[PDB]
Amino acid sequence: QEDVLAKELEDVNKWGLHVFRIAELSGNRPLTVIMHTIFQERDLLKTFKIPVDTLITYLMTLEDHYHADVAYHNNIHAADVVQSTHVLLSTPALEAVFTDLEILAAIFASAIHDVDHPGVSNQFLINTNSELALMYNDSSVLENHHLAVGFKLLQEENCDIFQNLTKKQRQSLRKMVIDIVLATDMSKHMNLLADLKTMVETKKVTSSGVLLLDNYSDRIQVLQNMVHCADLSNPTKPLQLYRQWTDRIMEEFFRQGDRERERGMEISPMCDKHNASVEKSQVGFIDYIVHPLWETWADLVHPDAQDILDTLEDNREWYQSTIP
Amino acid sequence: EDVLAKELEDVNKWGLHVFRIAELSGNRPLTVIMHTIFQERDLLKTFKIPVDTLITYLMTLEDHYHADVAYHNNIHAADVVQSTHVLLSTPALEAVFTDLEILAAIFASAIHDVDHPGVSNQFLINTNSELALMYNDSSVLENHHLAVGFKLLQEENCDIFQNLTKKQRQSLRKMVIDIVLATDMSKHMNLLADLKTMVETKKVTSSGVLLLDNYSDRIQVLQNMVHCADLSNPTKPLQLYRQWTDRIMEEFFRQGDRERERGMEISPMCDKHNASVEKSQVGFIDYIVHPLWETWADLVHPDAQDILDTLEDNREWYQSTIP
Numbered sequence: 001q002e003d004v005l006a007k008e009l010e011d012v013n014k015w016g017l018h019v020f021r022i023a024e025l026s027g028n029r030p031l032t033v034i035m036h037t038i039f040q041e042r043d044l045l046k047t048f049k050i051p052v053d054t055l056i057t058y059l060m061t062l063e064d065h066y067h068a069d070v071a072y073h074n075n076i077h078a079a080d081v082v083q084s085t086h087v088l089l090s091t092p093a094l095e096a097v098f099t100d101l102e103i104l105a106a107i108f109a110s111a112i113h114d115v116d117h118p119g120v121s122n123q124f125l126i127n128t129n130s131e132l133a134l135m136y137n138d139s140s141v142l143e144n145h146h147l148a149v150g151f152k153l154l155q156e157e158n159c160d161i162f163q164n165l166t167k168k169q170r171q172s173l174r175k176m177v178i179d180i181v182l183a184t185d186m187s188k189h190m191n192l193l194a195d196l197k198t199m200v201e202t203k204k205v206t207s208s209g210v211l212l213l214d215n216y217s218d219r220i221q222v223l224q225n226m227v228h229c230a231d232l233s234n235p236t237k238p239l240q241l242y243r244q245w246t247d248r249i250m251e252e253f254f255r256q257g258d259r260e261r262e263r264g265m266e267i268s269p270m271c272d273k274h275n276a277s278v279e280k281s282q283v284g285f286i287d288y289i290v291h292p293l294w295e296t297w298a299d300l301v302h303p304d305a306q307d308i309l310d311t312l313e314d315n316r317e318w319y320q321s322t323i324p
Numbered sequence: 325e326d327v328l329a330k331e332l333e334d335v336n337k338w339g340l341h342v343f344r345i346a347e348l349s350g351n352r353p354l355t356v357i358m359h360t361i362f363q364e365r366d367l368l369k370t371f372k373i374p375v376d377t378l379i380t381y382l383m384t385l386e387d388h389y390h391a392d393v394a395y396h397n398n399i400h401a402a403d404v405v406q407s408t409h410v411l412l413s414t415p416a417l418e419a420v421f422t423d424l425e426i427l428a429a430i431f432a433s434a435i436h437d438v439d440h441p442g443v444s445n446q447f448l449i450n451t452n453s454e455l456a457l458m459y460n461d462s463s464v465l466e467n468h469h470l471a472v473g474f475k476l477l478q479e480e481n482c483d484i485f486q487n488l489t490k491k492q493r494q495s496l497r498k499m500v501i502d503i504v505l506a507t508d509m510s511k512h513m514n515l516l517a518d519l520k521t522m523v524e525t526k527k528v529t530s531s532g533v534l535l536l537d538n539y540s541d542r543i544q545v546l547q548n549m550v551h552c553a554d555l556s557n558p559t560k561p562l563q564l565y566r567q568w569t570d571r572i573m574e575e576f577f578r579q580g581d582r583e584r585e586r587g588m589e590i591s592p593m594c595d596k597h598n599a600s601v602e603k604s605q606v607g608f609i610d611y612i613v614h615p616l617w618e619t620w621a622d623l624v625h626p627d628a629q630d631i632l633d634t635l636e637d638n639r640e641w642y643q644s645t646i647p
């Protein structure tokens with residue numbers, strides 16, 4: 001079984017990794033084993049002098065703080081966003097663009113970006129006067145919490161994977177990670193996409209043909225949209241993966257809608273298991289959110305992501321075909 | 325208790341004897357000044373606030389300002405409340421703000437520094453504090469002030485908004501959050517630029533009363549109004565101003581002592597062995613306080629003239645104390 005797991009982890013550089021199989025083969029440790037594999041593949045333990053036992057201890061604690069009883073926003077989702085970011089970081093249009101520290105920030109941000117997610121939306125937490133929404137003044141409630149947990153866990157016994165970074169390195173990494181995870185709040189999507197389109201329309205490329213990003217604002221904006229793309233990458237995956245993600249998000253949505261219906265609240269969009277159209281909701285999600293984003297990312301790295309965009313468009317056609 | 329009532333008759337005036345009221349009230353200036361302002365604006369009848377609930381909340385809120393913090397305590401909170409109360413009655417702002425916006429501005433003022441530890445956001449970030457960890461280094465204190473102010477409403481007989489509709493509560497909450505987050509000094513320059521923009525394009529009646537049609541402009545004015553109240557010490561009668569300066573320097577110096585003991589770089593104006601209190605006040609007026617208050621004065625022209633005159637008198641006096 002360990003041999004089969006190792007075989008599957010050989011696909012870590014590929015879009016469409018068998019992440020649900022890896023979750024089973026690893027004993028529900030997909031985040032730990034995929035993060036470890038990526039850190040080895042990118043030589044990050046050597047570069048940042050991360051003790052392997054410290055990395056594994058932190059990853060297992062982080063993974064533990066994802067909720068195993070939440071259908072979508074769990075450790076498998078985290079592992080999936082990590083691996084998807086890892087693939088996007090390797091796109092030819094970004095070769096030698098980002099530093100090792102920026103690469104570390106994007107991958108760490110992906111790993112922590114939904115930690116301790118309770119399986120309900122920001123709007124639900126606000127409308128129910130939750131302790132989280134009270135702590136965070138209704139503003140990026142979950143995303144602020146994911147950051148606070150992800151950073152706090154570094155202080156647990158033998159968990160500081162950044163113990164050998166310089167002070168300036170730690171300061172820079174912390175700021176970049178905060179900037180990246182806060183950009184996963186869907187309330188920021190429209191402004192984030194508008195900005196990404198502006199960068200595409202004005203983009204500069206070097207003599208080697210890679211993106212020229214010569215200031216923090218442009219560099220962090222690319223990393224923010226990269227992780228946001230990874231977070232919204234399910235409909236761009238092979239259909240057997242995409243359908244499992246759809247099954248999971250609908251279960252999570254329906255459980256929230258059951259709580260809203262109980263409380264006499266208006267049921268959130270797509271959360272009513274008695275008045276649901278899963279297929280129409282996927283086509284709308286793709287048409288208004290996922291394809292606008294991924295078409296713009298594909299434009300930024302053109303033509304690196306053409307196959308990913310082609311898969312998204314095929315999956316949209318497939319879901320659309322199940323309506324009439 | 326009769327002299328206390330005598331002092332409170334100036335509640336509508338710039339320069340209220342807030343330190344005298346703090347002493348006469350048994351260190352309850354926030355409670356008695358908030359209560360006075362709520363009665364004077366009839367906010368209890370307008371919003372069906374039981375007087376026992378108001379007093380209970382106000383005492384609990386006041387209890388969560390630190391008595392061993394020289395500046396950011398309940399006297400400062402009461403001062404900002406009462407200052408906001410006066411600025412809300414600016415004639416050039418007549419008919420601008422709804423009753424809920426007025427309640428939001430006054431409530432925001434009361435909670436805007438609650439549970440302040442007497443050290444800056446940068447100190448909290450640099451010492452890897454639990455507060456900075458919770459709030460991801462962003463408006464750390466101001467997020468905490470809001471969280472405490474609202475959490476205290478859930479204490480027994482403390483929900484002063486219990487007879488507001490759900491929609492009214494949601495609207496007030498958003499406004500209060502927007503106002504208190506704007507008291508973070510790292511937002512001052514952007515706030516001032518937006519106040520300036522509003523001054524350049526301001527629309528008034530023939531009588532010179534401001535016309536603010538959209539919520540974005542109205543919340544910007546309320547943010548700058550409470551920010552002005554927060555930064556109003558140099559605009560008060562000099563005797564009050566000098567007491568505030570003594571307190572902020574005591575607080576700054578206590579921060580610099582903690583920084584020195586920890587081996588940290590001492591924050592500006594926080595080194596008691598290398599301070600220039602008077603030069604610092606002149607620079608603070610010249611670069612922060614006067615630009616803000618003269619822009620505010622342009623917005624409400626001529627209603628802020630006496631306040632601006634006091635500020636300029638006080639700047640001249642502090643400069644004269646520099647040899």
Ligand SMILES: COc1cc2c(cc1OC)CN(C=O)CC2
Pocket residue numbers: 234235245246249270281282285
């Ligand atoms: C796979 O389908 C979806 C995935 C996700 C959403 C919606 C979807 O379909 C309508 C919205 N999100 C909320 O957290 C992000 C993930």
Ligand SMILES: COc1cc2c(cc1OC)CN(C=O)CC2
Pocket residue numbers: 557558568569572593604605608
């Ligand atoms: C009375 O003098 C001052 C007051 C205040 C500051 C600085 C001052 O002088 C230099 C800065 N602030 C920090 O919280 C607001 C209050």
Ligand SMILES: [Mg+2]
Pocket residue numbers: 113114142184185
């Ligand atoms: Mg999220």
Ligand SMILES: [Mg+2]
Pocket residue numbers: 436437465507508
């Ligand atoms: Mg403050």
Ligand SMILES: [Mg+2]
Pocket residue numbers: 537538
């Ligand atoms: Mg109108």
Ligand SMILES: [Mg+2]
Pocket residue numbers: 633634
């Ligand atoms: Mg005069």
Ligand SMILES: [Zn+2]
Pocket residue numbers: 077081113114184231
């Ligand atoms: Zn996510």
Ligand SMILES: [Zn+2]
Pocket residue numbers: 400404436437507554
């Ligand atoms: Zn203040």
